[PDB]
A paper describes a structure:
Here we describe the successful de novo design and structural resolution of a coiled-coil peptide that assembles into multiple, distinct conformational states under the same conditions. The peptide forms an open αHB and a compact α-helical sandwich. We reasoned that introducing glycine (Gly, G) into this sequence should increase structural dynamics and potentially access alternative states, as Gly has the most backbone freedom of any α-amino acid, and it allows close approach of α helices. Therefore, we introduced Gly at all of the e sites to give CC-Type2-(LaIdGe)4.
Next, we crystallised and solved an X-ray structure for a 4-bromophenylalanine variant of CC-Type2-(LaIdGe)4. To our surprise, the asymmetric unit contained two distinct and strikingly different α-helical hexamers: an open, C6-symmetric barrel; and a closed, C2-symmetric sandwich with a consolidated hydrophobic core. To a first approximation, both structures have two three-helix sheets with similar helix–helix interfaces and KIH interactions expected for Type-2 coiled coils. The main difference is that the two α-helical sheets of the open state are related cyclically to give the C6 symmetry; whereas, those of the closed state is sheared perpendicular to the central C6 axis, to give a C2-symmetric bundle. As a result, in the latter, the aliphatic residues form a compact hydrophobic core. However, relative to the open barrel, the remaining chains of the closed state are rearranged significantly with average translations in the paired helices ‘3’, ‘4’, and ‘5’ of 5.92, 6.98, and 6.05 Å, respectively. We propose that the introduction of Gly at e’ in CC-Type2-(LaIdGe)4 perturbs this balance. The lack of side chain allows the helices to pack more closely together. This is apparent on closer examination of the structures: in the open state, the Cα atoms of the Ala-13 residue at g sites of neighbouring helices are spaced regularly at ≈9.3 Å; whereas, in the closed state the average distance is ≈8.8 Å. The helix–helix–helix angles are all ≈120˚ in the open state but vary between 90˚ and 150˚ in the close state.
Author numbering:
A (entry chain B), B (entry chain C), C (entry chain D), E (entry chain F), F (entry chain A): 1 to 30
D (entry chain E): 1 to 29
């Protein structure tokens, strides 16, 4: 439905944020 | 609807947060 | 309504977070 | 109501995250 | 309810994210 | 339900973000 699909896109954006934070952590490790 | 469109804007703000973290990681990397 | 307005405030808070991250990335570039 | 109050608490958590990020920005200076 | 308790767990994770950012801020100036 | 399960995936993504931030903070110490 409308709300569920909108929540799935929010979940997708959060996974992308989580991925970007791992990259940051990798960068800080050298 | 009201709730669906409000969630959509939250989704956009989260994608923008992801983009900004991506840039931070690239700046730390380089 | 109650929920829609509360989701709008959450959306504004995420915009501010996104902005603060852009500021951090701009600092890291300068 | 139940959902609105839980969303207000989520907004409150987002304000503290914003605040911590601004302290991080100034720590980088 | 189902949704209320799910949103309370989301608030809980966000509070943990807040703390984690505080500790980053301390590691940075410290 | 659809919405409750979507919210649990969002909660899990946020716990993953908190965890990545703790790793960043630990890396900024050592």
């Amino acid at each position: 439905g409308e709300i569920g699909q909108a929540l799935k896109e929010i979940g997708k954006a959060l996974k992308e944020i989580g991925y970007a934070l791992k990259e940051i952590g990798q960068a800080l490790k050298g």
